[PDB]
């Protein structure tokens, strides 16, 4: 029953094709609730979940202005980072940031997060103390010095312990019917002969929310980690997620295998077998 709020910012340069595109999306747990895209015909922070639509015009104006200011500041950051790495003006580069807070069942701050990446590599992260930075390299040290000077960490601490937690609590209450509803997986085991000698047992979990799930195969009560093909958890498109785990078993040994499912929506963790 712990919960997270996160924002994900992506700025990507595209020399010869206009100014760097800035995108921002906001999530509570696995539910996206806002987006901004500088490439939109008329850029504004827009709702992506029913429970945020009740926020008034002052909400939408604040979030839009922040995004518009970010679009400009990220383009400045990208030019700066291009300089920090002695890079040509000809290449495309990406800057990403993800930040937010985690709260426990009582709604108290468990921890805050703020991390940035440049071209997919860790660049600078706010430490868990919310008061110092970890810089990945000598370029990120220049940013760290700027941010220290501007007293950024103190701003992040205030936000993370304050507005982040307060607004996550409000969103959780406003969207309680969905954000605080865990939907358990619908589970089944299918069997697909590979050859005379072997078959695939595939354990499915469908329709679950949130995405966090554990699917394991055991043979004679021993976990089959090395032998299990586990696909990435994937969105169904209706808020829910899907996952499966597969093992190749010798023919006639199917009953030695059990599929185990843990999900917070489940009254009790499930043990499943192929039922021919």
């Amino acid at each position: 029953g712990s919960h997270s709020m996160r924002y994900f910012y992506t700025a990507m340069s595209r020399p010869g094709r206009g100014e760097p595109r800035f995108i921002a999306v906001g999530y509570v747990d696995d539910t996206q609730f806002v987006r901004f895209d500088s490439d939109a015909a008329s850029p504004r922070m827009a709702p992506r979940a029913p429970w945020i639509e009740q926020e008034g015009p002052e909400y939408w104006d604040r979030e839009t202005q922040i995004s518009k200011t970010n679009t400009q500041t990220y383009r400045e950051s990208l030019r700066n980072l291009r300089g920090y790495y002695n890079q040509s003006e000809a290449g495309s580069h990406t800057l990403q940031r993800m930040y937010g807070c985690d709260v426990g069942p009582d709604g108290r701050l468990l921890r805050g997060h703020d991390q940035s990446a440049y071209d997919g590599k860790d660049y600078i992260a706010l430490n868990e103390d919310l008061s110092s930075w970890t810089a990945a390299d000598t370029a990120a040290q220049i940013t760290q010095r700027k941010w220290e000077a501007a007293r950024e960490a103190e701003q992040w601490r205030a936000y993370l312990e304050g507005l982040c937690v307060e607004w996550l609590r409000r969103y959780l209450e406003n969207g309680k019917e969905t954000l605080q509803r865990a939907d358990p997986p619908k589970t089944h085991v299918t069997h697909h002969p590979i050859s005379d000698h072997e078959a695939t047992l595939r354990c499915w979990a469908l329709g679950f929310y949130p995405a966090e799930i554990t699917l394991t195969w055991q043979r004679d009560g021993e976990d089959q980690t090395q032998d299990t093909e586990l696909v990435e958890t994937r969105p169904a498109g209706d808020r829910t997620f899907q996952k499966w785990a597969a093992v190749v078993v010798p023919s006639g040994e199917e009953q030695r295998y059990t599929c185990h499912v843990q999900h917070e929506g489940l009254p009790k963790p499930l043990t499943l077998r192929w039922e021919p």
């Binding site: 922040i66 995004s67 500041t73 400045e76 800057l95 940013t143 700027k146 950024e152 701003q155």
Partner: peptide, 9 residues
């Protein structure tokens, strides 16, 4: 809600 637009890198 978002953090205020942060300082340039």
């Amino acid at each position: 809600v978002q953090q205020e637009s942060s300082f340039v890198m």
